[PDB]
Design a protein around this nucleic acid. Structure first.
Length: 54
DNA sequence: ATATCTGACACGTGCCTGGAGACTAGGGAGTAATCCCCTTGGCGGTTAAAACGCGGGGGACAGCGCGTACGTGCGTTTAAGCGGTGCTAGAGCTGTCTACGACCAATTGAGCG
């Protein structure tokens, strides 16, 4: 039977003009910028490859 | 044969078009102050988006018949020149008044309380 019969409200709402989905990726890599990041970090903004040099 | 003609062939001055010089002074170009703008970007009441089951009617015939085409008849159409002669623009000139200049009032936008 069901792995659970009741479930949490993880961030999506029951009702409103608000989502049922959580924040999409474009809002995540925006809102994550407010944190105390440093020059040595595994920061997901920094991993996208550079432009082609030739 | 001859009179005298039609180029040869040029500088006369007219007209206006058209250029460059030296001036004022109108206005364009350089700039901050600063505001307020085009713009970036999350929010949820509202409609783009596509099935299923279905209503409105698109679709292809047969053939009736109120109009449509040809293209010649025949008498009515405009053409056509060139008479007179009033209109018509040129154009020469006012004789002002009318719209555009020079001096300064009612009404507005800006400042913030």
């Amino acid at each position: 039977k069901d792995p659970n019969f009741v479930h949490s409200g993880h961030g999506g709402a029951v009702a409103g003009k608000k989502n049922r989905t959580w924040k999409n990726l474009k809002q995540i890599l925006a809102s994550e910028r407010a944190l105390p990041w440093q020059l040595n970090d595994p920061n997901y903004f920094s991993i996208d490859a550079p432009p082609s040099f030739k």
